[PDB]
């Protein structure tokens, strides 16, 4: 039980991930933030108003900001990395360090351990020591964050490198010692205290699927301690921090999300976490810190919001004064200030609109085209700094209305983010989205996502019936890799070095692996499904024109499918009688008469009825998958059986599984 | 911890108590002092059965607290022992519990303690002329 009041502070421009920090300063600390235009600023919030300090000049988009100190001195040097170089400010507007670190594209993460500087890139990772290159690594996948264990509480510097493919490569020097496996692509990670864990060293990670962990990286192996795998708390962890807000004596875990959710985890079990307070914010949190910034003497949480609203959650009540008829006076002060500002701004912008109309805007959309694993549906999430007016969805929690015509979605009132599901079949590769904000010229920005023709994992099971398939002849390995990127959801674009790469995929609708190995001129695409290899054959032949069977595999796939169809049919059969039995329920109180069989349905009627709403889509998808399986497994032998479909449809209306397999093997 | 009764460790003391009545009269879960928290810090009790009641006292430090185990007379509480005059029950040593667990304390709560472990019980017949237990 805990309550935090939402007190708002200065608003800055749109911010990236982990772009807010608190200067350690017993009184109120200072907040420092970085806008996407380069204007790094800092304030102190003396009394209600932000007393700005060294609001610098605009430049490149501030991709990361971190405060550190050379020796055990109180860390105060704030380093940013805007376009390709790391700039550094003291606790005032004096720039002292400007390391050019000439690179190709940009920086996406950086860590300052005194003089040691561990920076990331798209794929590259560098470790400098005072503008001197000392370590250089090139992962095969994009890096999300880099950290180094405390070089003081331990002796060796072991930088950890979080890759996009669900691994943490805990490398030393310029080569990986070992790799820890984690569920979901890691996005944030920070040692879980002001030191890095009492019992030596501990690394706390948070992934983009929504998952926390405490990988304890020893010299040669990790020691998993706990995990906060969630069910309802979906949303990419963009920030996490450690601070004792509850006041019990042990530091708590302040964790942010991508759907606004801010959570505090207490360790009252003395070893394991437990949720204590959660709060939604209507935007995407990008940075979280503890301490106090307003009215020293009360611990609070500072939360950087995507659009820039640097909000705080305080432990101090807001109703300080309560006399007579009343409705506080700070509300009246803020009201009057906003009144005056909006009057004068209306004057100016009306005159400028007149001048512009008589003489007659780029923005950012933090989109996230992820793939839900518990379902088979991508969950697209658009975000804009301002509010949206309408979103087109052209193809080849939400409060919006449908845009159906090609879906047009209008967003009611003043909403920034929009989450919409998209369910695509195992085939049908080929999706645009026009976003329009509520600004005056009312422009529109288009995004082009791809629905690929399988969530990638790290291991398969070779004891399954593998329906191998071999491509040979006249390839540049980069080109074959480009084909596989065209064909597979989660693969890095840059061709991995070594001219020989192997990936271990997995179908999410039902567990069937798709091991894919390939060299400079040869490729083996093993599988557990006939549909997967048929689709691969067709799409790869199409790409080329642009530029074996285990006789038991069908049995295995049908045995996989059977439980799902059985469950759907039982769903239908029970929901057919739910309401008829409910009509009998309302009389004679059900004391002695109802059969136990239907009595098992009278309780779970609610869940049955709410699953029946989604049933027909699953049934249609299963019928389509079965008919594609049948057609393809007859197509490999060289036949064309596009005509026997209606008999299969009738059989599935009956669904005699043994008669089904008989019709499969016979005709 | 599964009570049938409660108590008060200190009639005027900064502490507390409890009583345990689990299975077959075992009263060895008696929670204890540091009464700011009254935690899992529980005093060692070697009581024979459940103290179906409890009490307190004044001239002693609530020692007079009574363990009225079923089938046995209450007992003034003195940490690990009793204080009984001429009808209040005897010491901590379970007079009924001990026979079951005096000779045949072979194994855990399973038929491989007595019915399938008749090695340490066909040699020991110590609780003589088994009536109480």
């Amino acid at each position: 039980d805990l309550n935090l009041n939402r007190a708002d502070y200065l608003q800055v421009g749109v911010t990236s991930q982990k772009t807010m920090k608190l200067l350690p300063a017993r009184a109120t600390q200072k907040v420092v933030v970085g806008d996407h235009d380069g204007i790094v600023m800092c304030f102190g919030m003396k009394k209600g108003e932000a007393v700005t300090v060294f609001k610098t000049l605009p430049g490149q988009k501030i991709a990361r900001l971190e405060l550190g100190g050379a020796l055990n001195t109180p860390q105060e040097k704030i380093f940013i990395a805007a376009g390709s170089e790391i700039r550094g400010f003291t606790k005032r507007g004096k720039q002292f360090l400007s390391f050019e670190t000439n690179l190709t594209e940009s920086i996406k993460a950086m860590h300052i351990s005194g003089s040691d500087l561990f920076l990331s890139a798209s794929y590259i990772y560098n470790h400098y020591c005072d503008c001197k290159d000392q370590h250089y690594y090139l992962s095969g996948d994009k890096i999300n964050d880099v950290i180094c264990l405390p070089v003081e509480r331990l002796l060796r510097e072991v930088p950890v490198l979080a890759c996009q493919d669900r691994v943490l490569r805990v490398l030393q020097g310029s080569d990986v010692t070992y790799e820890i496996e984690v569920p979901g692509p890691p996005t944030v990670l920070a040692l879980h205290n002001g030191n890095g864990g009492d019992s030596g060293e501990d690394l706390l990670f948070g992934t983009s699927d929504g998952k926390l962990g405490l990988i304890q990286i020893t010299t040669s192996k990790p020691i998993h301690k706990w995990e906060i795998r969630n069910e309802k708390k979906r949303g990419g962890i963009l920030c996490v921090d450690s601070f004792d807000i509850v006041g019990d004596g042990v530091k708590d875990l302040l964790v942010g999300r991508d759907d606004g959710m801010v959570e505090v985890y207490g360790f009252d079990n003395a070893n394991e976490p437990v949720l204590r307070f959660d709060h939604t914010l209507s935007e995407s949190v990008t940075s979280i810190q503890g301490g106090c910034v307003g009215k020293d003497g009360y611990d609070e949480i500072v939360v950087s919001t995507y659009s820039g609203w640097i909000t705080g959650l305080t432990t101090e009540p807001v109703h300080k004064e309560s006399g007579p008829g009343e409705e506080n006076q700070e509300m009246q002060n803020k009201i009057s200030s906003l009144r005056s500002e909006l009057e004068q701004l209306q004057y100016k912008v009306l005159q400028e609109r007149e001048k512009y109309q008589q003489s007659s805007p780029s923005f950012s959309v933090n989109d996230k085209f992820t793939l839900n694993k518990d379902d088979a549906s991508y969950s697209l999430i658009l975000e804009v700094q301002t509010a949206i007016d309408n979103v087109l969805i052209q193809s080849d929690k939400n409060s919006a209305v449908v845009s159906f015509s090609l879906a047009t979605y209008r967003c009611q009132a003043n909403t920034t983010r929009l989450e919409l599901k998209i369910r695509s079949i195992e085939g049908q590769y080929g999706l645009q989205a026009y976003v329009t904000p509520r600004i005056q010229p009312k422009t529109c920005q288009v995004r082009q996502y791809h629905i690929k023709p399988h969530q990638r994992t790290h291991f398969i099971d070779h004891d399954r019936p593998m329906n191998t398939l071999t491509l040979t002849g006249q390839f540049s390995f980069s080109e074959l890799h480009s084909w596989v990127v065209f064909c597979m959801p989660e693969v890095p674009e840059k061709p991995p070095a070594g001219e020989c790469v192997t990936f271990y995929f997995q179908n999410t609708f039902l567990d069937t692996q798709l091991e894919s190995t390939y060299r400079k001129g040869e490729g083996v695409f093993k599988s557990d499904n006939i549909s997967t290899i048929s689709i691969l054959k067709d799409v790869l032949s199409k790409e080329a024109t642009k530029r074996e069977i285990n006789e038991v595999s069908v049995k295995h796939t049908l045995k996989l499918i059977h439980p799902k169809l059985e469950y759907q049919l039982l769903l239908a059969k029970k929901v057919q009688l739910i309401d008829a039995l409910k009509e009998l329920q309302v009389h004679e109180g059900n004391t002695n008469f109802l059969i136990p069989e239907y009595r098992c349905i009278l309780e779970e009627a609610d869940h049955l009825q709410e699953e029946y709403k989604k049933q027909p889509a699953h049934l249609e998808r299963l019928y389509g998958m079965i008919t594609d399986l049948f057609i393809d497994k007859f197509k490999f032998k060289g036949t064309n059986v596009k005509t026997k479909v209606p008999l299969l449809l009738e059989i599935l209306d009956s669904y005699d599984q043994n008669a089904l397999i008989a019709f499969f093997d016979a005709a | 911890a599964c009570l049938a009764l409660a108590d008060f460790h200190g009639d005027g003391e900064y502490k507390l108590a409890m009583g345990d009545l689990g299975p077959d009269g075992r009263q060895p879960r008696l929670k204890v002092l540091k009464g700011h928290t009254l935690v899992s810090q529980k005093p060692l009790p070697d009581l024979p059965a459940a103290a179906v009641t409890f009490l307190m006292a004044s001239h002693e430090p609530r020692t007079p607290a009574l363990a009225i185990a079923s089938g046995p007379c209450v007992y003034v509480y003195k940490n690990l022992k009793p204080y009984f005059k001429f009808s209040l029950p005897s010491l901590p040593t379970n007079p009924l519990e001990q026979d079951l667990w005096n000779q045949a304390k072979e194994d855990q709560i399973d038929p491989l303690t007595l019915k399938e472990m008749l090695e340490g019980i066909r040699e020991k017949a110590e609780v003589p002329l088994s009536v109480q237990s």
């Binding site: 006041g247 003497g297 009360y298 432990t315 101090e316 009540p317 109703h319 300080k320 004064e321 309560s322 006399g323 007579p324 | -």
Partner: protein, 165 residues
Amino acid sequence: EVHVLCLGLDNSGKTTIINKLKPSNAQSQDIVPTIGFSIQKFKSSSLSFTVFDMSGQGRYRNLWEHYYKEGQAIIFVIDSSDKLRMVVAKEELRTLLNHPDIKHRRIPILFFANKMDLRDALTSVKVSQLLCLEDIKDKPWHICASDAIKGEGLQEGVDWLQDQI
């Protein structure tokens, strides 16, 4: 000159306000018990006003019922950490003000809350507005501005209470 009385809830120990409500010359670092019968001059939100002090044990909350009738000005306080011992402080105004002596004079009559830096609280007014007791209207005041021990908010209902004298 203008006195001030406060009582408080039972089983709390919430009486430590009058020391930090006193001046800076003689501030006390020990916890100040609400013994009552206090005699001092303290510069308040209107002028250098006076005070009075009492103890609230249920057995003991009757000496405050022995000094209840009098007082130049008045005083409001409560225990806003009490989730069970604040049902009993509801009747305390009907003990205090319902009495005939309190009702007769239009001086200062307000009840305020406390224990804000403690990890539970309620409405600012608390005594006359949170626990359904908004009906203190004919009493010629209102009370506000409460913290726990850090020393805030004694000038909060002051226009209704302190500067109203």
